[PDB]
């Protein structure tokens, strides 16, 4: 008689006693175990009874017996897998069972499970419990799985650096290796690790508990290992004054990595400030103020932005960080290397900030090129490049392209109502900008000691806005008309809905104003139009100005003046 | 020596008993100081017989109790307790057993720990004929005379565990389940079940505390009552079937299964104790001579019970006996070869578990 | 006199989006309001001379001063539409026409109707105000009218809110150069015709309501209408700044002969016309009045009637082309407005006088009162500023010395005068010289050889000789020289 | 400005040191008709004193009241020649005081003194209060604070250098501050607010002007230095004439075309607003009695500048003879009319522009003009019976009550008009000549015993006429006329019963004598 049949009979007899008498079933299984100590079925069944009875003390000792004697049973691995899943009422019961076993056995079992895994995803999380549960295993495996995570993300070729692999690395794998002092790592490993961490951080902030704070802490830890956001900029500047003046690999690594980190932080703060959606958009423009006449200050109204001081300071700090970073040849070359290593398109907000920098820098040609780049990468809300390219054209004495861009700007304007200003994208602020710009361009065009009269008529039409701030301008215009005479404008009586203008132009017809032959229509009819035009007084001046501008796209032909 | 006896003749019975108790205490203390092993001469025994109504007996028991509580030295108290209640082979024994039983009962009532310890050490060093009588008297007056009095016996578990173990051994030796009149009461078995379940070591303390220097005399109380519990679980279905209340029978069967599990656990830890004490394979707490009578009792109960109608009880008893024997052999409690096991149970009724245990 | 300077510049032709009715230009609203004003002034203020100068680039007077309000009422609807607003020219022209027609003392209320769109420059109000104030020169700012004017401005431009966006300070300051005599008027609300009607009613009740008064001569009484309204008067700006007005009840306090009153300094001639409170002639005509009786009796008798206008004030109620009426003057407020009448509270009826001072035959007259201390031109002062006066005096004293001893008293009186002036001015050398001429004329005594005359001239010469020493012999001022017996 | 203007208080000073004793090198030719004497030149003191006296004469003639002036000759001592009381700012008193002072001593002690004492006295004297200032201050109890005591100080001297001029400038500023401090604590002394300073310097002709002319310079907000300089004689007199012309806002006149030379007058400026540096009004023919009550808007006094010359004498004697004189500004427009009101030659400023009160509504068309039986002549008698006359003796009414005579006139007017029917046909008692004595007597305040006899006779003749049934004026049976006339007489007398007990006596005399049915 084979012993297997006796074991089955003993198990079957004990199984039948389970619903009636657990103690009798346990007594049967105790005798069965004594007869056949090497039988797995007897031990597993009474192990199952303890698990069903939820007796951790007995069951916990039993799992060790099965593990150290019968590790090849698939049921043991299946049950162990359920326990690991619970680790990642029954869940608490299984968790308490895990704590009964000694730590030496627990770590040995976990390492065995790590080899059994097939997918790298489930494998990484399976072992991740062991490192936190057993911090002493960091030196043995912390670096290895970090590189394994590095290649696992690499072999999948994700379009974005945001994935399970990177998130596991930066949030969990990154802190544990750097914090441990026993685990010593080379400087190059530190550089690649911090590069990946910074990439994950910027991806997260642009698109978790504290991305920027974690990145700053990681940067500080890296700086300490190799040995506010404002004072550190000055401290690196002092180090430049102490090290950049004369391999100095540590100095170069610091002066590039810390600088780019603080630059990225300041740039993201500034971008979240202006146009927060891509992080009531704001647009750093150049509004000519005296249209009726390297350390510049950005003038911004506090009503549209109550945090102007801090964001201005952030922009300033990013400014010297960029200036210092591109200055040193070595530091600039390493920045170019790291930026080309990243996605060279550099998303959207980096381009926006670089455009703003170029606008403030003074090189408006590069500003126009970057505006073209941004437009290709893309008032409503998106047409910031419209006003930006308009002011860029206006800076470099274009006087044709700027008018073209301004006219195209109000093509998308629908609303019934120098120094670097800062205005929102709402009509109430952009419309005065366009009107001032066009008034300036046509004022320069007309006042040229030439025979042009269309330019003078146009500077008359645009002098209405913000009456009577153009008082001296209109005085000069009427004096010029009196000196010249024979003023001609076919569209005059379709745009001048102002009463001082009309009153003066009627006085120009009488003797004391001189018999100035005014050709303002396209003798009694000359008075007749005024009998009708005055009835248009009180209308929305913005509306009539906008209608005049959109209707007469031949302004560009007149801009030749 | 006669001066003490002459002095006590002028006092009343209670006063003479107290004075002779004090004199015996002083004499035994002096003897123990002079020599490590005192000798109990006939003088103190005669004085106790001569000097030591219901009210007078109650006052005498109370004086014994408070005197025993007053004494702090264990050896003198044990020696005096023995001299008071050791067998003497005279006609005055029945009075001495009666006094011992009354004193034990009243000490249990008022929790006299020194008296309980003295009684526990007494039960180990006398023949079982008086231990079974004391056990029967305690079971009676704590279960059948006054209902609800067995709770007072339950608190002794936390007070005098040695006394509880001695009482368990005595009741196991007394109640062999050989007759319906020997069927143990429900309250006593319930209390024993709770006592053993609360502490498996309650019956193993007696094996550990005393130094094992010689084999116990034949006819005395066993060191560990595991033999009695094994006999109880083996003969429980047979005696109950012979007696044949369904709920009471079910509760009794459940309690017997619980105590069988407790006995298995006790043997399992006794294996480790024997390994620690280096007595594994050398000292056997379960004598082979005590298993033949219970095997014959099981066989005669099987023959008398007409197994054609009571097959379940016979099978369960055989399975319990096989399990107990296998656990004892594995745990080293029983030191015998498998040939003796095969020969002894060859006449026993056929059982699959028993045959597997025999074959191993 | 009122000049209704109404703006006609193109700024006033702006239509206003009034709710409900059709579109009215501000010119039409001004026309309606001024039509109400002219109707009221032609019904209850008929005696008022009014004129309507329009201004824009140039000011032109369509109708001069006239009482024919039917002429003006049509001028408001036959208007041109000249452009360019220019206020300074308008004010200069108004000053010119007022000074040409009336003069410089009669008041001229100026109901000016602007639009709150002052101008753009050059002729605009802002440019003139900002510059001419610190420039003046020949083209001085005309806003301080050179006569007791009162500048009202119907700035009919919505509420103050509409005109406060650009310019209201210019106008309200423009009032202030008239020494504060004026008031800005704004049409609060959505420029409804009812609102402009209310504003013009406010102007009417402020300026163009007649000054009804009850004339009482003892117990006889009548109700009159003193045109023009009496201008408040101020005694000074240091001892009594609060202006005083005339009491409503003019209590007549006597009568003074016209020749006695001479031509008194009046403040303002005021007509008095009885008022009833062809019906005007068929009911009020046939009821006997007082004013008619007083005027008739004054014209026939030829006297005046002093009037107690109030505390410390006083007037006069006289009679009268061939037409006549009862025009009443107003004297200067003060104790004795007429110096040749005594303190006017010291005039009492002839009954309380001892005799009849005016005479039984009406010949004597206590008036006028001679001054207490006689002036110079009536007394005999001795001016020696030019040499002509001193030469005349010495020639007179020499000539009368020839007529001695006939006019001895006159010669000695004039010599005493000369001596008094001599010690008064310390011209002691002059006295020595005049003594030398006295001796000279003694040497040229005629052949008549009058005995007394020689003695008098010798005595006088000795007196001048001793007085020319300067010692206290005759140097006393009262020591007049006496001729010898 | 107000009564207490900066011209209210003028304190002349004159240099009196022996330096002010030589001649002014302007010897005169008072010898007209053998060998005449050497021409005599007036001493510089004489020139200054006489020209200042002429200034004072013009001041007095033009402003008889409310403008007082002191005189402080500055010698070894500091004498003030007259106080501020109006009864002491008289010309002849000034003449007497200056005569008592006497000519400056030639050789007493030349350098012993300077004019600083005169200036310090002038500021000290300027601190006092005029009688009119006292009246104003007591009038404004608890409010006599806004009474500006601003004056003006005029000084004449011969300063040797501009250094001395600056010296007394500092001296006068310091003493002004000291006097202001002294008057701050005291009560019977005002604090000077503005004291315009004039320091006319004179020298004999032919000598260099050691001090150049200077313009205004305010050394303090309580001073105005305007030191001029001019030679003695006619130049000094013309300078002081200009000063008086430009101080009190005076103006000139050049009345010409006088039938017999030209004449010039000084009078207050405001008379020239009609024309708007001597205007050239021409005499016009004085009509005897063409019109009587002209329209005069200002009665300004006049004062000749050559008072004893032939043209001024002739013109002013003609004026004071009584007749007026009508001038005419240069088709002709009648204008300013001279006249003589008791010996104070006024210059009325008539009005020749169009009168805004022209073409008045006819009194025959206004209310009350359509009734043609008015008692115009009877009211004329009523008017001539209430004529006015001044009272220079203020009588007492009852007890400590000095009656104001105009209140008497108003009460008399109220008495006389208690029963004055308004048209002839309205009344019948008044039109009958019998009641005339009673009509003219009963209205008096207290009818005398002779008046009692007259009224008794009047009622007796009234009863006689009633008995005779004589035809009374129509003004309706014969007895009805008598009845209504008795009723009118009773109504008249009953109204004046409270006038006196004699009125009540004649009242019950009427009651007894009346023919009441």
Curated annotation (Swiss-Prot), chain A:
Keywords: Isopeptide bond, Nucleus, Phosphoprotein, Ubl conjugation
Presence of keyword Nucleus: yes
Nucleotidyltransferase as UniProt keyword: no
Coiled-coil residue windows: none
Subcellular location per the Swiss-Prot or TrEMBL entry: Nucleus
Record location of the Glycyl lysine isopeptide (Lys-Gly) (interchain with G-Cter in SUMO2) cross-link: 366
InterPro entries assigned: Int_cplx_su10
GO-annotated biological processes: regulation of transcription elongation by RNA polymerase II; RNA polymerase II transcription initiation surveillance; snRNA processing
Assembly with partners or alone: Component of the Integrator complex, composed of core subunits INTS1, INTS2, INTS3, INTS4, INTS5, INTS6, INTS7, INTS8, INTS9/RC74, INTS10, INTS11/CPSF3L, INTS12, INTS13, INTS14 and INTS15. The core complex associates with protein phosphatase 2A subunits PPP2CA and PPP2R1A, to form the Integrator-PP2A (INTAC) complex. INTS10 is part of the tail subcomplex, composed of INTS10, INTS13, INTS14 and INTS15.
Function: Component of the integrator complex, a multiprotein complex that terminates RNA polymerase II (Pol II) transcription in the promoter-proximal region of genes.
Name by which UniProt lists this protein: Integrator complex subunit 10
Species, as recorded: Homo sapiens
Species lineage: Eukaryota, Metazoa, Chordata, Craniata, Vertebrata
Swiss-Prot record, chain B:
Cellular component, GO, one term: INTAC complex
Pfam families according to UniProt: INTS15 (PF14964)
Organism annotation: Homo sapiens (Human)
Keyword annotations of the record: Chromosome, Nucleus
Covalent S-S links between cysteines: none
Family membership: Belongs to the Integrator subunit 15 family.
InterPro entries referenced in this protein's UniProt entry, alphabetically: INTS15
Function: Component of the integrator complex, a multiprotein complex that terminates RNA polymerase II (Pol II) transcription in the promoter-proximal region of genes.
Chief location category: nucleus
Assembly and oligomerization: Component of the Integrator complex, composed of core subunits INTS1, INTS2, INTS3, INTS4, INTS5, INTS6, INTS7, INTS8, INTS9/RC74, INTS10, INTS11/CPSF3L, INTS12, INTS13, INTS14 and INTS15. The core complex associates with protein phosphatase 2A subunits PPP2CA and PPP2R1A, to form the Integrator-PP2A (INTAC) complex. INTS15 is part of the tail subcomplex, composed of INTS10, INTS13, INTS14 and INTS15.
Subcellular location: Nucleus; Chromosome
GO terms for biological process, alphabetical: brain development; eye development; mRNA splicing, via spliceosome; RNA polymerase II transcription initiation surveillance
Top-level taxon: Eukaryota
Protein name: Integrator complex subunit 15
From Swiss-Prot, chain C:
Keywords in alphabetical order: Acetylation, Magnesium, Metal-binding, Nucleus
Protein family: Belongs to the Integrator subunit 14 family.
Annotated InterPro entries: INTS14, IntS14_b-barrel, IntS14_C, VWF_A, vWFA_dom_sf
Pfam families reported in the protein's UniProt record: IntS14_b-barrel, IntS14_C, VWA_2
Subunit structure: Component of the Integrator complex, composed of core subunits INTS1, INTS2, INTS3, INTS4, INTS5, INTS6, INTS7, INTS8, INTS9/RC74, INTS10, INTS11/CPSF3L, INTS12, INTS13, INTS14 and INTS15. The core complex associates with protein phosphatase 2A subunits PPP2CA and PPP2R1A, to form the Integrator-PP2A (INTAC) complex. INTS14 is part of the tail subcomplex, composed of INTS10, INTS13, INTS14 and INTS15.
Positions bound to Mg(2+): 9, 11, 85
Role, per record: Component of the integrator complex, a multiprotein complex that terminates RNA polymerase II (Pol II) transcription in the promoter-proximal region of genes.
GO biological process: regulation of transcription elongation by RNA polymerase II; RNA polymerase II transcription initiation surveillance; snRNA 3'-end processing; snRNA processing
Subcellular location: Nucleus
Expression by tissue: Strongly expressed in numerous cancer cells compared with their non-cancerous counterparts (lung, prostate, colon, stomach and skin).
UniProt key word Cytoplasm: no
Name this polypeptide is given: Integrator complex subunit 14
Coiled-coil stretches noted in the UniProt entry, renumbered to this chain: none
Main location: nucleus
Domain VWFA: 1-203
Curated annotation (Swiss-Prot), chain D:
GO biological process: cell division; centrosome localization; flagellated sperm motility; mitotic spindle organization; protein localization to nuclear envelope; regulation of fertilization; regulation of mitotic cell cycle; regulation of transcription elongation by RNA polymerase II
Gene Ontology cellular component terms for the protein in this record: cytoplasm; INTAC complex; integrator complex; intracellular membrane-bounded organelle; nuclear body; nucleoplasm; nucleus
Family: Belongs to the Integrator subunit 13 family.
Name by which UniProt lists this protein: Integrator complex subunit 13
Assembly behavior: Component of the Integrator complex, composed of core subunits INTS1, INTS2, INTS3, INTS4, INTS5, INTS6, INTS7, INTS8, INTS9/RC74, INTS10, INTS11/CPSF3L, INTS12, INTS13, INTS14 and INTS15. The core complex associates with protein phosphatase 2A subunits PPP2CA and PPP2R1A, to form the Integrator-PP2A (INTAC) complex. INTS13 is part of the tail subcomplex, composed of INTS10, INTS13, INTS14 and INTS15. Interacts with transcription factors ZNF609 and ZNF655. Interacts with PAFAH1B1; this interaction may be required for proper recruitment of dynein complexes to the nuclear envelope at prophase.
Primary location class: nucleus
GO MF term (any one): DNA-binding transcription factor binding
Highest taxon of the lineage: Eukaryota
Gene that encodes it: INTS13
Domains (record comment): The cleavage module binding motif (CMBM) mediates recruitment of transcription factors.
Subcellular location: Nucleus; Cytoplasm
